[PDB]
Design a protein around this ligand. Structure first.
Ligand SMILES: CC(=O)NCc1cc(Cl)cc(CC(=O)Nc2cnccc2C)c1
Ligand SMILES: CC(=O)NCc1cc(Cl)cc(CC(=O)Nc2cnccc2C)c1
Lengths: 304, 304
């Protein structure tokens, strides 16, 4: 028993982290096979960052201008190319620690582990979610760019995120491993609207199932609701509309606890309308939305 | 910016995890050098666990009865011994992935990362604190015994905890790497009083400094307090008494933000007496006590 915001073990990813330096800028790179992936703003100076012409900036750079260091050993760069907002640096050596991996574009509401890195070295690992507005509420400082988000299935690391920037609002923006930003964000120092964020309804319900599994049951009630009535409440409280697909993904949790999804929705409805009344659920005084139904099942069953 | 419950990167510890089987019981072991450390209840059966005579149970076991598997390879056991509540299995091979390490007995209120494991394989990593009552509020299931807690300083892994059991109250108990339980707990199936827990006052103040650093300042007020007046409030709310040593450890955070410790105590006092009023601090609706002042400095400065 017990429920924690658990991250995947970071070992397979620690072995891929490298430091990439170009000109005066140093950030993190991801070494998989003979390729190092890193944000393309590594080629910019502070003056360049207001409206950088990346194509022009990259033209002034040669393979020898990108300094890639893995721990203490220097990697030899034999090719460079830009794909969307990432640079792909071909190196003459395949990373001997390359795990089985995939590049995936996660959906908003999905979660992943982030290995925060500075100068190619890891500092910590934390679990987070891609917000409905495509930002991530992370913990990142200057030099953390190039840190990656990932998931792990048995032996395969699915890389889903690469950190690029912090918005003026303190939230974080980045790309998939093909360099496509999640959201409307561009890699330039300009005003950027993050957009209205909502609460991940299906995740809150999953976390309510995790609470029941771990003995926290005070919020269960004698009521039920319908998808339409629950969605009127979700609208009022900036919760994502719950769909039949969400109800279906909650099936395993509904089967394990014997609490129908719509009965759990009525608990969520009462909690939204009345609050916690000074009480807690799984050590939290607010409704947690950074656990997917899959995360709850994985943690409550002990999948390694 | 941003503040997260961040764990240390788990790689150095993943490389030490092994599976230990004895009789019908399988749990996790920690392979450092030519020694595998694991909970001594690995030698018990379910009937034995009510009042096990460990010395007698271990006498019926030989080196060949302890099956130690590292990934997919079997380790040869050449010695076995019991030290307090841990078994030390000498193996004929030193772990090639043994990091630089120390065995440390952490103090209550200190934090550490836990690498939860099942059958010698890691499932996740989370940050937690040794509660003042010497329990840990973790996420552990059957088979997680032997999972370890640790801290990392540059290249040295300080092992501080080994998971042994779950109390009937759902909280977790375990030992240092010498087999000494933290707290009054014994490794037997009996009633065990966890004892009154308190809130780690110095950690809440550190987290209040982290909040100011990251823009959350709504709780700052026009008031100050004294150590004695603040401690009367801490008593009333089951908060640990704040001492001059705590004030001193908060010095770096006080220097960085320019907010005197006693002024921050007056903010904490007002928050304890009036609550959050439906607001949040660093995404939390309650006062967080699982970040030490050192954790705050490390995260806010990006130490790798
Ligand atoms: C406001 C802003 O940062 N816009 C321009 C911009 C656009 C890009 Cl592609 C990159 C950067 C640097 C950057 O944001 N780094 C960073 C990352 N995470 C935490 C803290 C920092 C300082 C800056
Ligand atoms: C109530 C109780 O567990 N007492 C006896 C006892 C004492 C000891 Cl040394 C060990 C065990 C097993 C045990 O608690 N395992 C476990 C660990 N973490 C999470 C879930 C589980 C089931 C059992």
């Amino acid at each position: 028993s017990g429920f924690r915001k658990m991250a995947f073990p970071s070992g397979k990813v620690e072995g891929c982290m490298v430091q990439v330096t170009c000109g005066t800028t140093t950030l993190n790179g991801l070494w998989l096979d003979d390729v190092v992936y890193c944000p393309r703003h590594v080629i910019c100076t502070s003056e360049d960052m207001l409206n950088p012409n990346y194509e022009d900036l990259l033209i002034r750079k040669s393979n020898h201008n990108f300094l890639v260091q893995a721990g203490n050993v220097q990697l030899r760069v034999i090719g460079h190319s830009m794909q969307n907002c990432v640079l792909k640096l071909k190196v003459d050596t395949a990373n001997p620690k390359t795990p089985k991996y995939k590049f995936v574009r996660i959906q908003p509401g999905q979660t992943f582990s982030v290995l925060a890195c500075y100068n190619g070295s890891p500092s910590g690992v934390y679990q987070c979610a891609m917000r409905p507005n495509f930002t991530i509420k992370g913990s990142f400082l200057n030099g953390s760019c190039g840190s990656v988000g990932f998931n792990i299935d048995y032996d395969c690391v699915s890389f889903c995120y690469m950190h690029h920037m912090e918005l003026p609002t303190g939230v974080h923006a980045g790309t998939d491993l093909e360099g496509n930003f999640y959201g409307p964000f561009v890699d330039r120092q300009t005003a950027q609207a993050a957009g209205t964020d909502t609460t991940i309804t299906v995740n809150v319900l999953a976390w309510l199932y995790a609470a029941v599994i771990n003995g926290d049951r005070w919020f269960l009630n004698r009521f039920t609701t319908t998808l339409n009535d629950f969605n009127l409440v979700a609208m009022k409280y900036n919760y994502e509309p719950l769909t039949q697909d969400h109800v279906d993904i909650l099936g395993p949790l509904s089967a394990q606890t014997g609490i129908a999804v719509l009965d759990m929705c009525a608990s969520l409805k009462e909690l939204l309308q009345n609050g916690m009344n000074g009480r807690t659920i799984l050590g939290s005084a607010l409704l947690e939305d950074e656990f997917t139904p899959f995360d709850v099942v994985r943690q409550c069953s002990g999948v390694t």
